[PDB]
Amino acid sequence: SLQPPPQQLIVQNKTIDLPAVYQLNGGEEANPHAVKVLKELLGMLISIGEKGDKSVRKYSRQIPDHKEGYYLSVNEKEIVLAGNDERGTYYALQTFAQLLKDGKLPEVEIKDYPSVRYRGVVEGFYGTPWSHQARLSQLKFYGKNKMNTYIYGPKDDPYHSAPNWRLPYPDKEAAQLQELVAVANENEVDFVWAIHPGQDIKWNKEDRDLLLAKFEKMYQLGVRSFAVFFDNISGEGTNPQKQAELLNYIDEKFAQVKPDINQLVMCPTEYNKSWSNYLTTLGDKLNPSIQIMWTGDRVISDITRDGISWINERIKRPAYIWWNFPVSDYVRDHLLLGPVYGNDTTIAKEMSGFVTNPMEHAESSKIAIYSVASYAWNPAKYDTWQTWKDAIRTILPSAAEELECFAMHNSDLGPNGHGYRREESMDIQPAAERFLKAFKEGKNYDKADFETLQYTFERMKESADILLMNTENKPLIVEITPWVHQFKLTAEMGEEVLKMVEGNESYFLRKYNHVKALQQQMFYIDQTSNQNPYQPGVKTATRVIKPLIDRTFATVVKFFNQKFNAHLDATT
Ligand SMILES: [Ca+2]
Questions:
Q1: Member of which family?
Q2: Could you tell me the domains of the chain?
């Protein structure tokens, strides 16, 4: 099982023992980073290098003729880790490290190349920006998962947006960005520095030269990939040709002069189909090498063939997709740990790049980031649920099943203004529906469904109490602790309701008081944890579990009220 799935893979159904002694060749001309990654994993011959080096002269024919492609041959004879370019060798080494298990290697032959040219993440979400260490871990994760594009565009940074983009970075923040670029180059990831100079910027001669000066400064810091954002810029510079001429100018002056500029991206004022003459002029009057960002048919929507062919006509170039998942700046009381799906699996040629907008929690976003890194590399072989489970195991192997059980019930976004929903709590939904139908009409409940609900609530309690004390991935646990508390409380309330449907009178009253106390606990967590201006509080399992619990509670409470002339408060 390899991730992301390679294009062509041949397995010989036989294993090869570890070479205790080896004679590696080509280390002086291959990628030094891949050389270090290889030596950290360490007679038998091992050849490694980019196409054209003497070490891989024998295997230049088998190299895929695509950027970031590689050829990896492990057999009884020797080992070949050849790459189409310097980044392809690093990706080959990542796949090779995936192949190694307990010092044994399968006899395989792999030819690989990315399906989408640019793949990665953009840190454009509203809310608390990531820490420096979190960004370093994210860069290393991207490098391990064959992602190449990280767009540094945090909304709460004054030096890349209005009005301080003209200012140089302070020496300390400049050193921080320098170490970011250093780690990115160490793991072969394009640090795309974003800038958004809008705010009603009527064009002139000063501001453009200040843009060029800031670009030269960031180049002095080591940045080699840049992007200009007009994302709903309220500027009167929503004029199409003004933006087109500005981007053409910065390409004509800064890109052609500088030797190793990699990416040049721009985001139009209209980045979705619902917010629309503008994109046509943009695509006609822009340089061919510059990319144009896009988010889909809506502000937060999936990518369909009719949703991409409709735009690729206007911009006259392959789109640079910007998916808004699992970003939760519009519903941050919920967790979005559901699987990545909905995008068509056969539109790789219709887009230049695919970048995801993640949550304010990085380790929690790693699930969808892993899924996108697999899908953006090979949409034809993108297994949705298997990749989701593989991401869960990769992030927390010690508690893979527990994190799986938790994420299964934290997927839906709940009601919101964008109308974006996610499927959640599916495997138990038929049991919940059958049980609520059996008790809503006063009939007899199915026993198998009762045992299933017991098992689910017990497993929720177990998974919550296991996740609370995990230390293998501490940042993740620190991110999801309040939601795990609410999850455990929901499991306990459901367990007590399941004991309430099997009644004497005093036992029922005790369980009723217990359920009320648990609702108070939930309100306390809602009013204390995750306090933000827009969507404060903590919510979990709101798709199936919470409605089922509330409805069963109300049903049994009304039955008791009409059976004993009581007037219990069934409000939740
Ligand atoms: Ca070389």
A1: Belongs to the glycosyl hydrolase 84 family.
A2: 8-112 (3.30.379.10), 118-395 (3.20.20.80), 429-564 (1.20.58.460)
Centre of ligand 1 from the C-alpha of residue 362, in Å: 34
Residue 526, helix vs strand vs coil: helix
Residue partners of 439: CB distance under 8 A and separation at least 6: 445, 501, 552, 555, 556
Token representation of residue 175: 């050193």
* Helices of type H across 412-473: 429-440, 447-467
| Strand stretches in 31-89, DSSP E | 44-50, 70-74, 78-83
What does this entry list as its resolution, in Å?
Answer: 3.1
Mapped onto helix, strand or coil, the DSSP state of residue 500 is helix
Q: How far is the CA of 30 from the centre of ligand 1 (A)?
A: 5
* Helix (DSSP H) and strand (DSSP E) numbers for the chain: 16, 14
DSSP reduced 3-state for 529: coil
Annotate 217-263 with DSSP letters as a single string: HHHHTT--EEEEE-TT--SGGG-HHHHHHHHHHHIIIIITTSTT---
Give the other-Cβ count within 10 Å of 557's Cβ: 19
Q: Which two tokens stand for residue 7?
A: 């294009």
Give the DSSP H or E segment for 265. Answer: strand 264-267
Distance of CA 279 from the midpoint of ligand 1 (Å): 40
Q: Indicate left, alpha or beta for 50 from its phi (over 0: left) and psi (-120 to 50: alpha).
A: beta
As to burial, measured by CB atoms within 10 angstroms (0-12 exposed, 13-18 middle, 19+ buried), residue 504 is: exposed
In DSSP terms, 10 is beta-bridged to 109
DSSP 15: E
Compute the distance from residue 202 Cα to the ligand 1 centre, in Å: 46
Phi, psi of 496 (to 5 degrees): -70, -30
Distance 91 CA to ligand 1 centre (A): 15
Q: Provide the β-strand partners of residue 78.
A: 45
Q: How was this structure determined?
A: X-ray
Q: Cα separation of 59 and 71, whole Å? A: 8
What burial class does residue 144 get, using C-beta atoms within 10 Å of its C-beta: 0-12 exposed, 13-18 middle, 19+ buried?
middle
The Å distance, Cα 86 to ligand 1 centre, comes to: 6
Tell me the C-alpha distance between 321 and 344, whole Å.
13
Q: How far is the CA of 180 from the centre of ligand 1 (A)?
A: 24
Read off the DSSP letter of residue 163: T
386 in Cβ contact with 415 (< 8 Å): no
d(CA 305, CA 51) in angstroms, rounded, equals: 35
Sign of CA dihedral 527, 531, 536, 539: negative
**Residue the block writes with tokens 């008790």:** 439
The helix (run of H) or strand (run of E) holding residue 86 is helix 86-99
227 CA distance to ligand 1 middle (Å): 28
Amino acid identity of residue 41, one-letter, is: L
